[PDB]
Amino acid sequence: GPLGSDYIIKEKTVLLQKKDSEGFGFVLRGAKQTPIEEFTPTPAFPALQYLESVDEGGVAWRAGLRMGDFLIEVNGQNVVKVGHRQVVNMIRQGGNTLMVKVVMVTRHPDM
């Protein structure tokens, strides 16, 4: 809008249940965070980790996750401000089960 950016914000929480001999079918990308300054989420940059890619037809894809989704929670733990290695460890904790909350942000262009 004339006074600032407008965004569509869509939250998605999914329960992923994979087989032993497959992956969940996504690549997580994000920061490893600085103790010096707290991360402040914004609509454009809502979390430190996001889905760099999602395998079409894979487990995550079939549940509704998409490339570009930002990761908010893993198995009931908030990860908005959490570094990459800890989030990886949290995801691996559940084995073949992973429940995540992500958010998809789309900036509605004015022109």
């Binding site: 992956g23 969940f24 079918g25 996504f26 690549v27 997580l28 990308r29 994000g30 920061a31 490893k32 760099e52 995550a60 990459h84 290695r85 990886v88 995801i91 992973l98």
Partner: peptide, 6 residues
Amino acid sequence: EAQTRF
């Protein structure tokens, strides 16, 4: 940034 496939 790091990345990890799942």
